Design a protein around this ligand. Structure first.
Ligand SMILES: C[S@@+](CC[C@H](N)C(=O)[O-])C[C@H]1O[C@@H](n2cnc3c(N)ncnc32)[C@H](O)[C@@H]1O
Ligand SMILES: C[S@@+](CC[C@H](N)C(=O)[O-])C[C@H]1O[C@@H](n2cnc3c(N)ncnc32)[C@H](O)[C@@H]1O
Ligand SMILES: [K+]
Ligand SMILES: [K+]
Ligand SMILES: [Mg+2]
Ligand SMILES: [Mg+2]
Ligand SMILES: [Mg+2]
Ligand SMILES: [Mg+2]
Lengths: 392, 395
């Protein structure tokens, strides 16, 4: 028998209270950038029963309505009554937003005077990019399936297929994998879990039926489902209270759901609410582009890339490439090609990925359903770069 | 000798995110001291002149959340607007409710489920990691960044560097060699420190004092050489700091809390959570498992994943990988792990004594990492003997 192992990833949909915060933070960023592309934004959000607070550091020429951005974001997600766990028109909106520290501003951007090539990293830290040939979008299947199931769970609520749904939901997929000389080859889906908020009109048997038929079966390729696949469907047995009423939310508390579902690696930095001088976001986006380009150019079946920075220093402190033994040329050669092709300086990454463009929900769209593996053209870091190499 | 560069960072107890982790766990400690069965999901945030604690607590404890906040800030050194937050003058906001009854019924039956029947407090997945590259079975990049930050706090509190303020960050790039899947440190390539300071010190003095008093005492001499790069307060001015300089939140340092980018992370934060939250108890048990695999000599490195569904005691999946370093097959290590560790949350809670708080039990975890610590309160660092047939023995 084939040797296999089990790997699990989860997701949450746009109504989860932490994801609500990510989306509000990015809605604030979008609003700032639409009026002032040079906005310095570090917008955190938190939420609990009938309360949202936006807090952090914004230096902008924009005139912003923080309250309206909060209410508008809540409304689009479906938080329009106390019965669904937050009412956009009732909740108290608190604001604690100040200009960026002048001590940070002078060292990072010289108070809006540094040229792009001289812009310092907005902070220290490290960031990883990952790609794998196991799906067409070059993302891990466990992550892709959990994420797409959660997006479908939102879609069947909004389109009237499952009218009993409420906004807050989570998903989890256990994939049975084969290791093919370091490449990951999915075999089957071992376990699928959904926990979704619901109204008082639906039985648990109806929830289970409707989740399997309307949400799971449309998303998981048939070749990965069999009679042994385990289903956990609303295992708590009651999920009527939800949203911020059921669970406090914060920005940047879904960073593995935002990235690779536990595959690759994570350096710890959150994405939402941050302008592109924050290398947590621009640097993670460029190393996704790099890892994805290595795999898409056929140089490897899987790739991991690390970059690291120091506040106020344009050039990265370190870069790493690992192909898990799948590279067709040595990893040191791939590192050389990556370092010749990608400009890791933040002012450069910002321009090369058009990251000062907000509005029409540019960043808000990234703040649910993952930052990576998305074909929307606003996800500029998913565009593959041609790499110069001699295929042996 | 082919090498690669791997970087980890840390922050010390005065970083605004870490201040939030410590407040969250100070709240947990206070609840558990009086009511070991407290249900706690305490989030904290902070910005200029403001701390908010919020979330879900079901406790019999007689608690003043504002006092816990102010005491925790005060103890870290946030005693004035000049250092970035005044523990005694700042606004303290509280938005704390009982746990959802819909969660309470499914997880613990409103305090009626026996330990073996307690459901996971949530879904999710968690990873544990160990590596033989340090005595504490942790990655060197992480250990060095973490210990440098701890020393950065120590030299402020002990009067070695009087110009220091509480908020500081560190970062270490280690040059590594791959020995058949085992990680062998070669040298430290780059060290970075950014620390808050007063107006009395020049950048030359900061660089000197950080190298001589903070870095050289921590990094083994064998890893430093005349090519090691030092970035010391590269921004050039860090006088504003703490919550005044940067908003903080609970659970925004989850890689600093764990393995510094090594191993893997399932995304769940630790601080502010009672042990029915498998984000904390499950991560602690899979650290104990990975550490036990390496400490028993069964592998040089090990990664363990576990996953859960809310309301279900038994995990949905378990994975073991030894990066090609195992001395028995990974499938056999997985079998031994499953036979040795009880992954059910009510069981993990008792086996790791996780309902004991007070005397700073959990607050001590909320800075300087949850793993690789020798304090006996870190019960998940105790190695379990594992039963296996060592290849080098007949018996
Ligand atoms: C289970 S709550 C986390 C722990 C919680 N803070 C506590 O007080 O125990 C985490 C997420 O699970 C979901 N959730 C909320 N209520 C639930 C319920 N009754 N059953 C299942 N999942 C639920 C929501 O997506 C929520 O944001
Ligand atoms: C650089 S701030 C993060 C970005 C910030 N929110 C903004 O508005 O740009 C992150 C951390 O860096 C540190 N920091 C604050 N001010 C700094 C400065 N002037 N120089 C270097 N590091 C600083 C503190 O530890 C702070 O919590
Ligand atoms: K929470
Ligand atoms: K922040
Ligand atoms: Mg959360
Ligand atoms: Mg960071
Ligand atoms: Mg932070
Ligand atoms: Mg979680």
């Amino acid at each position: 028998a084939m040797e296999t192992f089990l790997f699990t990833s989860e997701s949450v949909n746009e109504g989860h209270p932490d994801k609500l915060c990510d989306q509000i933070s990015d809605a604030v960023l979008d609003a700032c950038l639409e009026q002032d592309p040079d906005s310095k934004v570090a917008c955190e959000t938190c939420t609990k029963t009938n309360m949202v607070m936006v807090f952090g550091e914004i230096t902008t020429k924009a005139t912003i309505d923080y309250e309206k951005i909060v209410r508008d974001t809540c409304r689009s997600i479906g938080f329009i009554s106390d019965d669904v766990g937050l009412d956009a028109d009732k909740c108290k909106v608190l604001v604690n937003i100040e200009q960026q520290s002048p001590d940070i501003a002078q060292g990072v951007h010289g108070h809006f005077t540094k040229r792009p090539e001289d812009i310092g990293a907005g902070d220290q830290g490290h960031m990883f990019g990952y790609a794998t040939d196991e799906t067409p979008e070059l993302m891990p299947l466990s992550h892709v399936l959990a994420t797409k199931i959660g997006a479908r769970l939102t879609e069947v609520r909004k389109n009237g297929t499952c009218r009993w749904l409420r906004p807050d939901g989570k998903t989890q997929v256990t994939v049975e994998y084969y290791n093919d000389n370091g490449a990951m080859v999915p075999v089957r889906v071992h376990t699928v879990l959904i926990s979704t908020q619901h109204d008082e009109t639906v039985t648990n048997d109806e929830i289970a039926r409707d989740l399997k038929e309307h949400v799971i079966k449309p998303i998981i390729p048939e070749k990965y489902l069999d009679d042994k696949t385990i289903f956990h469907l609303n295992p708590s047995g009651r999920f009527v209270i939800g949203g911020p009423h059921g669970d406090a939310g914060l920005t940047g508390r879904k960073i593995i759901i935002d990235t690779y579902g536990g595959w690759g690696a994570h350096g710890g930095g959150a994405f939402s609410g941050k302008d592109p001088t924050k290398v947590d976001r621009s640097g993670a986006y460029i190393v996704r582009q790099a890892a994805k380009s290595v795999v898409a150019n056929g140089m490897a079946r899987r790739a991991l890339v690390q970059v690291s920075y120091a506040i106020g220093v344009p050039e990265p402190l370190s870069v790493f490439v690992d192909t898990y033994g799948t590279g067709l040329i040595p990893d040191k050669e791939i590192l050389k090609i990556v370092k010749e092709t990608f400009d890791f300086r933040p002012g450069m990454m910002t321009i090369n990925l058009d990251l000062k463009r907000g509005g029409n929900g540019r960043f808000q769209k990234t703040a649910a359903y993952g930052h990576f593996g998305r074909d929307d053209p606003d996800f500029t870091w998913e565009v593959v770069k041609p790499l110069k190499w001699d295929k042996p």
